[PDB]
Design an enzyme around this catalytic site. Structure first.
Site, PDB file in Angstrom:
ATOM      1  N   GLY A 145      49.620  77.825   7.816  1.00 42.32           N
ATOM      2  CA  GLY A 145      50.620  77.844   8.806  1.00 42.32           C
ATOM      3  C   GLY A 145      50.358  77.847  10.102  1.00 42.32           C
ATOM      4  O   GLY A 145      49.708  76.842  10.445  1.00 42.32           O
ATOM      5  N   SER A 146      51.158  78.567  10.853  1.00 39.63           N
ATOM      6  CA  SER A 146      50.932  78.370  12.412  1.00 39.63           C
ATOM      7  C   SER A 146      49.464  78.722  13.031  1.00 39.63           C
ATOM      8  O   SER A 146      49.331  78.477  14.205  1.00 39.63           O
ATOM      9  CB  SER A 146      52.264  79.179  13.218  1.00 39.63           C
ATOM     10  OG  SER A 146      51.926  80.668  12.828  1.00 39.63           O
ATOM     11  N   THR A 147      48.703  79.262  12.323  1.00 42.02           N
ATOM     12  CA  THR A 147      47.399  79.698  12.563  1.00 42.02           C
ATOM     13  C   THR A 147      46.626  78.153  12.892  1.00 42.02           C
ATOM     14  O   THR A 147      45.531  78.382  13.418  1.00 42.02           O
ATOM     15  CB  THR A 147      46.601  80.600  11.751  1.00 42.02           C
ATOM     16  OG1 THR A 147      46.522  79.653  10.350  1.00 42.02           O
ATOM     17  CG2 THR A 147      47.339  81.739  11.291  1.00 42.02           C
ATOM     18  N   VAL A 148      46.836  77.172  12.346  1.00 42.13           N
ATOM     19  CA  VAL A 148      46.184  76.068  12.652  1.00 42.13           C
ATOM     20  C   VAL A 148      46.497  75.288  14.214  1.00 42.13           C
ATOM     21  O   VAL A 148      45.937  74.332  14.455  1.00 42.13           O
ATOM     22  CB  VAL A 148      46.137  74.960  11.731  1.00 42.13           C
ATOM     23  CG1 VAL A 148      45.711  75.453  10.331  1.00 42.13           C
ATOM     24  CG2 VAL A 148      47.743  74.394  11.554  1.00 42.13           C
ATOM     25  N   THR A 334      49.894  84.646  15.310  1.00 41.01           N
ATOM     26  CA  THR A 334      50.669  84.921  14.168  1.00 41.01           C
ATOM     27  C   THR A 334      51.812  84.173  13.546  1.00 41.01           C
ATOM     28  O   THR A 334      52.184  83.250  14.291  1.00 41.01           O
ATOM     29  CB  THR A 334      51.382  86.502  14.425  1.00 41.01           C
ATOM     30  OG1 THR A 334      51.860  86.906  13.347  1.00 41.01           O
ATOM     31  CG2 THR A 334      52.421  86.346  15.587  1.00 41.01           C
TER      32      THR A 334
END
Length: 406
Positions: A145-148, A334
């Site tokens: 998800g948004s962690t990349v 997060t």
């Protein structure tokens, strides 16, 4: 039939053989459920069936090659205790199906903590279902998800697509009929603000402004799509796309973290590389003798700027402000995604994740917290307060000096 003793990095016992009767001994695990998935267990005899008890079964018994030996895992029981305590109570508080937490040393690549909730008791496996026995940190995969998003900014800066002080147009546009929009529709955001608001419109402009092989190469440099190589049973390497033809929408979703599945351990190795400012060191479950050279995979200057830009997520304005720690600077990320069942489609079950390093001055630890299926509670993410609680106890236990002003 004796068996060696495995301890933590300081010598604290995690699995011993205590005598029950004359001569005959029984295997005892003093940590219990705090490190059940990693240590493992034995059957009626002295044979390893799960965890380290099986991965090092020949080294512990040592039959045919000298006497029985001991093993010092890279885990610190002080950190392992607080990681499991905050995670096991968070999975229960949010009524979650499961939860995983992996803590990795940045400078050495040593796994300092590895917890899973719910857990079992290896001292008495009576009444423990198999669904709560597999090491979910290495056997379960999920969309990062948004962690990349940080790695997307690292590529745009390295490829000269966008400068560090460039202002992007975050107006919600469409990609051949797909509404690419954000929750808070900002007309424009600075490059640091794109990571602050986790703007999908901003990172989609970056991915389409460079070939599809750019982000595919960048994620592979940080360890995504590669085996972690620890020796534990069921250790999965994730699902990584090996395609050559990309579409206008698949390149955007690839920038959003969707389209690839990785284990919580792989995601921890990525931020362990982010913390090292672009140094890829192999992961280890046992105590390693420094130094660990590793290998540089990304320029240090580019990762340095992105680490400084990831602090806005925890500062007032970012999506991870609920994960802040008193007197410390953290570079976290997060978000909340959607589960993918065996059919390959999205089900109405969410996954909250939070990954970051600390301290932002010179990071020493990398933490990943994944809360699976948070039924009860609120997302406005459930995994953010668990990160600050876990990382806060780690920084204080290891006597790391404060980073930010109180």
């Amino acid at each position: 039939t004796s068996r060696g003793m495995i301890t933590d990095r300081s010598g604290r016992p995690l699995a011993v053989s205590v005598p029950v009767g004359g001569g005959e001994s029984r295997r005892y695990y003093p940590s219990g459920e705090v490190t059940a998935h990693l240590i493992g267990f034995t059957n009626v005899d002295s044979q390893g069936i799960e965890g380290v008890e099986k991965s090092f079964d020949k080294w512990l018994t040592g039959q045919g090659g000298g006497a029985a030996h001991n093993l010092a895992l890279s885990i610190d029981e002080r950190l392992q205790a607080l990681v499991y305590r905050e995670l096991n109570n968070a999975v229960a508080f949010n009524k979650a199906e499961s939860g995983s937490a992996v803590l990795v040393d940045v400078n050495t690549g040593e796994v300092l903590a590895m917890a899973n909730s719910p857990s079992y008791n290896p001292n008495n496996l009576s009444g423990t279902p198999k669904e709560a026995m597999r090491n979910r940190t290495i056997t379960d995969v999920f969309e990062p998800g948004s962690t990349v998003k940080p790695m997307v900014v690292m590529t745009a800066l390295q490829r000269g697509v966008v400068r560090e002080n460039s202002v992007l147009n975050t107006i919600p546009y469409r990609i051949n009929g797909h509404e690419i929009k954000d929750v808070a529709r900002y007309s424009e955001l600075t490059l640091t603000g794109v990571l602050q608001k986790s703007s999908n419109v901003g990172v989609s402009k970056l991915a389409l402004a460079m070939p599809s092989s750019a982000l595919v190469d960048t994620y592979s440099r940080f360890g995504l799509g590669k085996a972690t190589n620890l020796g534990l049973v069921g250790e999965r390497s994730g699902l990584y796309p090996q395609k050559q033809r990309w579409s206008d929408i698949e390149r955007a979703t690839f920038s959003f973290g969707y389209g690839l599945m990785v284990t919580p351990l792989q995601l921890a190795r990525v931020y362990a590389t982010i913390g090292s400012y672009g140094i890829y060191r192999p992961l280890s479950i046992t105590k390693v003798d420094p130094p660990v050279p590793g290998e540089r995979v990304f320029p240090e200057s580019i990762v340095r700027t992105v680490v400084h830009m990831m602090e806005s997520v925890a500062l007032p304005g970012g999506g991870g402000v609920k994960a802040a720690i008193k007197g410390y600077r953290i570079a976290i990320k997060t978000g909340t995604a959607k589960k993918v069942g065996p059919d390959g489609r999205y089900i109405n079950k969410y996954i909250a994740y939070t990954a970051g390093v600390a301290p932002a001055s010179q990071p020493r630890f990398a933490l990943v917290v994944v809360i699976n299926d948070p039924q009860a509670g609120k997302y406005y993410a459930v995994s953010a307060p668990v990160f600050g609680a876990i990382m806060g106890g780690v920084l204080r236990t290891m006597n790391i000096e404060p980073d930010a002003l109180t």
